Amino acid sequence: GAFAGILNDADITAALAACKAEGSFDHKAFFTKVGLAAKSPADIKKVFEIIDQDKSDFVEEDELKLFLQNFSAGARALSDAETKVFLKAGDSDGDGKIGVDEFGAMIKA
Numbered sequence: 001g002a003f004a005g006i007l008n009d010a011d012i013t014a015a016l017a018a019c020k021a022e023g024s025f026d027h028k029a030f031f032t033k034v035g036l037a038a039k040s041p042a043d044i045k046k047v048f049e050i051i052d053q054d055k056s057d058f059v060e061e062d063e064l065k066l067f068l069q070n071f072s073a074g075a076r077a078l079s080d081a082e083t084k085v086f087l088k089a090g091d092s093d094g095d096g097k098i099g100v101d102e103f104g105a106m107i108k109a
């Protein structure tokens, strides 16, 4: 997968299975189960760059909605409500988008 050399396949499978059900996504539980919580800035930056599909330098709402699909193309979209909670949690400064430092801070909360 896209995170070979950074994350563990079994962990990714597990993190996806934990949020298969509609409404069940929880970034804290996802980040801990997927193994991201203890990764270095360099690794977090690489992950961030994958999620930032359009290289805008920020993860915007549209990219957050498709967050899971970076891990598996077959994964579901997040609901609008899931996406909003995720954005609110990540976007420390409230400017509407998530930068790499905000992304790392949410992970290491």
Ligand SMILES: [Cl-]
Pocket (backbone or CB within 6 Å): 025, 026, 027, 028, 082, 085, 086, 089
């Ligand atoms: Cl969340």
Ligand SMILES: [La+3]
Pocket (backbone or CB within 6 Å): 052, 053, 054, 055, 056, 057, 058, 059, 060, 063
């Ligand atoms: La972007």
Ligand SMILES: [La+3]
Pocket (backbone or CB within 6 Å): 055, 056, 057
């Ligand atoms: La730029």
Ligand SMILES: [La+3]
Pocket (backbone or CB within 6 Å): 091, 092, 093, 094, 095, 096, 097, 098, 099, 102
């Ligand atoms: La922000």
Ligand SMILES: [La+3]
Pocket (backbone or CB within 6 Å): 093, 095
């Ligand atoms: La800002």
